[PDB]
Amino acid sequence: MNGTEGPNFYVPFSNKTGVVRSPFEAPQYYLAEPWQFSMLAAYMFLLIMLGFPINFLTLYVTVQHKKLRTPLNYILLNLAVADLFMVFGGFTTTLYTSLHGYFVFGPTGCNLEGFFATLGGEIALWSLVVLAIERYVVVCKPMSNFRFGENHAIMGVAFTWVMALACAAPPLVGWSRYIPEGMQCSCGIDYYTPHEETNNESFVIYMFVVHFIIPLIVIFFCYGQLVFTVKEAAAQQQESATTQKAEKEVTRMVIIMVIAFLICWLPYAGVAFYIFTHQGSDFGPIFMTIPAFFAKTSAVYNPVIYIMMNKQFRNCMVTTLCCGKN
Amino acid sequence: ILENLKDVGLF
Numbered sequence: 153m154n155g156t157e158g159p160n161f162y163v164p165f166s167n168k169t170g171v172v173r174s175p176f177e178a179p180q181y182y183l184a185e186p187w188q189f190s191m192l193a194a195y196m197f198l199l200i201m202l203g204f205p206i207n208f209l210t211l212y213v214t215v216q217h218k219k220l221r222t223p224l225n226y227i228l229l230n231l232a233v234a235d236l237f238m239v240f241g242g243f244t245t246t247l248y249t250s251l252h253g254y255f256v257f258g259p260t261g262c263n264l265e266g267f268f269a270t271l272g273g274e275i276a277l278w279s280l281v282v283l284a285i286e287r288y289v290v291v292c293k294p295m296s297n298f299r300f301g302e303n304h305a306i307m308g309v310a311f312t313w314v315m316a317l318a319c320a321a322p323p324l325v326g327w328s329r330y331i332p333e334g335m336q337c338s339c340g341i342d343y344y345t346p347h348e349e350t351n352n353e354s355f356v357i358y359m360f361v362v363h364f365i366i367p368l369i370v371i372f373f374c375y376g377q378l379v380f381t382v383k384e385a386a387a388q389q390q391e392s393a394t395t396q397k398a399e400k401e402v403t404r405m406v407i408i409m410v411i412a413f414l415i416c417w418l419p420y421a422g423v424a425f426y427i428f429t430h431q432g433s434d435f436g437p438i439f440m441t442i443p444a445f446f447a448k449t450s451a452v453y454n455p456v457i458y459i460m461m462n463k464q465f466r467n468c469m470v471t472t473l474c475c476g477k478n
Numbered sequence: 479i480l481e482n483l484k485d486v487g488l489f
């Protein structure tokens with residue numbers, strides 16, 4: 153027996169010595185040293201210090217630079233708002249709880265932080281998906297006559313909200329649940345204990361299929377098409393040096409975007425899959441934190457990839473950061 | 479493609 157169960161929680165440490173306490177009531181210094189809790193706070197501190205300015209700066213330059221306010225940019229703004237839900241719903245809460253060594257806000261607060269942290273990360277994910285769809289549509293022109301405008305952009309944003317709710321909301325009302333996780337200082341979807349009263353198993357399958365596999369398939373198709381279209385245009389236009397460059401830069405971005413998506417979600421997927429296939433084995437607190445590390449850090453690296461590496465945003469950020477010049 | 483690529487932030 154590798155853990156300790158409780159009404160709203162599961163502590164990945166055995167209570168044979170009787171030292172385990174509820175993650176809502178007392179420090180968890182028996183499942184990790186105090187210093188590792190410090191390191192956890194240090195880490196959240198990093199993600200806040202990098203993730204706040206980068207994502208906020210994104211919203212700010214958009215207010216300052218008329219040119220950024222175009223429909224194809226809406227989903228990138230959305231992305232930055234989502235990253236901010238992660239930073240304030242999740243990262244700050246976790247900075248705070250980790251320094252107490254347990255989830256001091258209790259089961260209801262567990263639901264608040266789990267909801268907003270999950271909402272944020274899911275809006276982000278569906279943003280990356282919608283952005284790929286939009287790009288496919290605009291560049292690959294799979295629909296004759298179609299012109300992408302404001303209204304489609306809004307529908308793209310709303311779609312992500314809805315897909316995110318379809319993921320974060322259920323565990324608030326019967327299907328899966330939010331419980332503290334890994335080191336018990338932050339809360340997420342219970343994807344690792346069979347808890348029939350909430351139907352964890354099927355929810356995990358739904359997550360895997362609808363919120364990982366679909367996303368992954370849509371992104372590969374769209375960007376695969378996009379790279380194909382751009383290779384073809386270039387091959388038919390080798391007299392144009394610019395076009396040859398666009399093809400190289402675009403292929404490079406796609407590799408980067410796709411690898412980044414994998415790094416962010418594959419670990420959670422790989423771990424949820426394993427646990428599902430190897431029922432209730434000894435999964436330690438620090439091991440359950442690895443997929444979380446990968447997913448959470450995306451509130452920094454996504455804006456680097458999708459915002460800072462985008463010529464327009466970058467120029468506008470530079471102009472705004474240098475007080476108005478250059 | 480070029481104008482399209484610029485529009486979507488890829489080039």
Ligand SMILES: *[C@@H]1O[C@H](CO)[C@@H](O[C@@H]2O[C@H](CO)[C@@H](O[C@@H]3O[C@H](CO)[C@@H](O)[C@H](O[C@H]4O[C@H](CO)[C@@H](O)[C@H](O)[C@@H]4O)[C@@H]3O)[C@H](O)[C@H]2NC(C)=O)[C@H](O)[C@H]1NC(C)=O
Nearest residue numbers: 156157158159161163166167168169170171172173174175
């Ligand atoms: C992990 O394992 C530990 C060890 O089992 C476990 O902790 C124990 O929890 C029990 C209660 O569930 C604690 O019990 C208290 O003991 C004191 C006296 O020492 C009593 O005052 C408490 O109450 C009773 O007596 C009252 C008389 O006035 C009655 O009114 C009442 O009905 C009770 O009979 C209660 O017995 C026990 O002290 C701790 N032990 C330790 C070492 O902490 C812990 O809960 C397990 N963790 C999880 C998350 O399950």
Ligand SMILES: OC[C@H]1O[C@H](O[C@H]2O[C@H](CO)[C@@H](O)[C@H](O)[C@H]2O)[C@H](O)[C@@H](O)[C@@H]1O
Nearest residue numbers: 214215217218219220221222223302303
């Ligand atoms: O003063 C308004 C400036 O912002 C505009 O952006 C808006 O564009 C649409 C208005 O026609 C709205 O639907 C949209 O919600 C706004 O973002 C525009 O970009 C600028 O030219 C205006 O100066």
Ligand SMILES: CCCCCCCCO[C@@H]1O[C@H](CO)[C@@H](O)[C@H](O)[C@H]1O
Nearest residue numbers: 178179180247248249251252253254
């Ligand atoms: C950035 C804001 C700092 C967070 C405030 C940390 C407060 C932690 O408070 C500490 O928690 C201990 C539990 O380990 C308790 O023994 C004490 O209440 C206290 O020393």
Ligand SMILES: CCCCCCCCO[C@@H]1O[C@H](CO)[C@@H](O)[C@H](O)[C@H]1O
Nearest residue numbers: 285288292293294295370373374377
């Ligand atoms: C999630 C969005 C993807 C929609 C899948 C539509 C499948 C259409 O696949 C077809 O192949 C090519 C597109 O690359 C084009 O030649 C056609 O217009 C397109 O409809």
Ligand SMILES: CCCCCCCCO[C@@H]1O[C@H](CO)[C@@H](O)[C@H](O)[C@H]1O
Nearest residue numbers: 269270339340341359360364444447
């Ligand atoms: C990828 C599909 C497999 C299903 C596993 C679902 C686990 C996702 O869990 C989510 O991850 C976020 C990033 O840490 C956390 O912040 C959220 O609180 C948590 O709900």
Ligand SMILES: CCCCCCCCO[C@@H]1O[C@H](CO)[C@@H](O)[C@H](O)[C@H]1O
Nearest residue numbers: 372375376379399400403406407410
């Ligand atoms: C979503 C799928 C990503 C598509 C990755 C395409 C990788 C191909 O790679 C690209 O094309 C050439 C192959 O002829 C390579 O030699 C070049 O280095 C590169 O531009």
Ligand SMILES: *C(=O)CCCCCCCCCCCCCCC
Nearest residue numbers: 201470471472473474475476477
């Ligand atoms: C107008 O031109 C003002 C721009 C000058 C700002 C340049 C100052 C550099 C600051 C770099 C960031 C340091 C923060 C590190 C703290 C952890």
